[PDB]
Structure 1
Amino acid sequence: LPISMSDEGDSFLVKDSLGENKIPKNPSKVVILDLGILDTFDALKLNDKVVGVPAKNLPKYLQQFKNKPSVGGVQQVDFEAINALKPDLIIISGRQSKFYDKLKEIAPTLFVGLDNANFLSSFENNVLSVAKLYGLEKEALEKISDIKNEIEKAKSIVDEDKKALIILTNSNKISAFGPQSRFGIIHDVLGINAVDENIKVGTHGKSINSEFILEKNPDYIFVVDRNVILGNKERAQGILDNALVAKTKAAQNKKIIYLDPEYWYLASGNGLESLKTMILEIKNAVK
């Protein structure tokens, strides 16, 4: 399940949860489909190694890669474009696991998935494995260290009594997420208590309504509005403007927090800088 690597010696033999690859050291033509690992290449000064990115889903904080060749979107993967580039490495996360075999035909394909049950250790493993390919472990370890310090700063101001609910909105549907989920970092790493520790659910969450939100009466509601990533004009603010949500402590104290979906939904948690931004976003909403 974690990435492991043996040096031998112009290359690494690399094993991860999807399979095995010989990856050359210092690859010079890397197609990156995980946006977080893309941010990490920037933080490690490896921008020139990147030859393909998913320009259809390129967020505001990664616009320094806007000039790179497109390999489509995180879901709409453009295989002909990837093949045309003749990359020496393709890096993917969970969203492209269904395309593994076709990708691995083109070139070695490294899986940098984030484990929702073990976010930090998978994050470190992902970043260090990538850094190892380039002999950059020292630099990566220093930046991981900074992230851990940001985590400690954020934890330090968390109000132990208060509780949060995490929701996703899509069209007019609300779904809920708790510990060990795709947004679990809020509870599992930053220490914010859940209104319901037992939601323990999947990729697009547990169906709920406003009645459920009032019943839980969260002090904080963290909202990931998926409509923004695609078709509005529906917006979480609209969905949540009703008398049930309005009675809630979160609504009353203006602690309905609209998290930037270009980080939370697109899931750039592998990024040495984007993960920091996400941590500060949570810290600043609760401090």
Structure 2
Amino acid sequence: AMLPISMSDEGDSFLVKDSLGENKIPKNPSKVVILDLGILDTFDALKLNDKVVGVPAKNLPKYLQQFKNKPSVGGVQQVDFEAINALKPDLIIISGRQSKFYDKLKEIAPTLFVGLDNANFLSSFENNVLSVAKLYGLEKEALEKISDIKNEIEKAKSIVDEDKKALIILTNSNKISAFGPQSRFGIIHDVLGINAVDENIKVGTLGKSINSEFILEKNPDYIFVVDRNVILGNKERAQGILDNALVAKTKAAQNKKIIYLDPEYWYLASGNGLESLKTMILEIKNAVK
């Protein structure tokens, strides 16, 4: 299990420890640079928009356009260090895409890691949201919105067909990769209760390389597709890649249950968002119901 964030009070500040390090964080930070898109959505949900001073405008999705005029600190992968240091932030919030920059970010300001644990999603989620809320004295408000997400998950779980099984795939250029329980798309199986076609696909951020023959051999009832081409701006599109005779023979193809999930939520990985996680839950739910 990834280590949780832990905090202790010290008057004007908290001493915070997370899986990457220790940081003294001031209470009520007022210049926050946010590189995790989910947490950025949680700032919105908690009415903390005016605290944010930097965002990754190169990867800002459609549901986060209230932050389009914030100063840009680049993208989720192409972090602009000069821009960040010019802002003089009091806090920088990252997730797993930026852990490789942690030392460099920590020289600028205290840097909090809000990674989602792929093997312990819901527990991680709650700890990331509550830790942020504690910085601002908003635990109460955050608890109430967490309780809303939990109720949405119960509604989604309750309509799931225990007989039926699903395969999760990612399309990049023209190649296909598969993901299963405890991967970066694990919540489909782990939280929402959808049975997997193969429990033995045991993967993290990088998927198991397969072809359509595999998909047909497994004959899933649902295929959930995340198209990485949309995010990277490639020409290739999963609808094209999956239009072939082998995929056409699956029960998923025959029942219109090939589901193209929005990659601005699933791939860009906005699960730390109090509203964005809800939208993703509903998207699974309305696809299956």
Instruction: Answer yes or no: same fold by TM over 0.5.
Output: yes
Give the C-alpha shift of residue 233 in structure 1: 1.6
Separation in structure 2 between the aligned mates of residue 141 and residue 231 of structure 1, nearest angstrom: 37
Give the C-alpha shift of residue 94 in structure 1: 0.1
Matched residue SS, 1:116 = coil
Separation in structure 2 between the aligned mates of residue 202 and residue 27 of structure 1, nearest angstrom: 33
Within 5 Å, give how 1:92-131 maps onto structure 2: 92-131=94-133
Separation in structure 1 between the aligned mates of residue 239 and residue 205 of structure 2, nearest angstrom: 22
For the 8 Å contact 2:42–2:274, the answer to whether it is kept is: yes
Q: Does 1:262 align with 2:252?
A: no
Q: Give RMSD over aligned pairs.
A: 0.4
Separation in structure 1 between the aligned mates of residue 53 and residue 233 of structure 2, nearest angstrom: 30
Task: State TM-score, norm by structure 2.
Answer: 0.99
Deviates more, 1:228-237 or 1:49-58: 228-237
**Which residue of structure 2 aligns with residue 272 of structure 1?**
274
Give the C-alpha shift of residue 202 in structure 1: 2.8
**Which residue of structure 2 aligns with residue 63 of structure 1?**
65
Give the C-alpha shift of residue 230 in structure 1: 1.5
For the 8 Å contact 2:182–2:204, the answer to whether it is kept is: no
Separation in structure 1 between the aligned mates of residue 174 and residue 207 of structure 2, nearest angstrom: 14
Q: What whole-Å deviation, never above 9, does each CA across 1:146-174 have from its counterpart, x for those lacking one?
A: 00000000000000000000000000000
Give the C-alpha shift of residue 50 in structure 1: 0.1
Unaligned runs of at least 5 residues, structure 2: none
Unaligned runs of at least 5 residues, structure 1: none
Provide the aligned length of Structure 1 versus Structure 2. 287
Separation in structure 1 between the aligned mates of residue 27 and residue 204 of structure 2, nearest angstrom: 36
Q: What whole-Å deviation, never above 9, does each CA across 1:225-270 have from its counterpart, x for those lacking one?
A: 0000023321000000010000000000010000000000000000
**Which residue of structure 1 aligns with residue 140 of structure 2?**
138
Give the C-alpha shift of residue 203 in structure 1: 1.3
Deviates more, 1:185-194 or 1:198-207: 198-207
Q: Percent identity?
A: 100
Give the C-alpha shift of residue 41 in structure 1: 0.2
Separation in structure 2 between the aligned mates of residue 129 and residue 275 of structure 1, nearest angstrom: 17
Matched residue SS, 1:117 = coil
For the 8 Å contact 2:94–2:114, the answer to whether it is kept is: yes
Task: State TM-score, norm by structure 1.
Answer: 1.00
Separation in structure 1 between the aligned mates of residue 208 and residue 149 of structure 2, nearest angstrom: 30
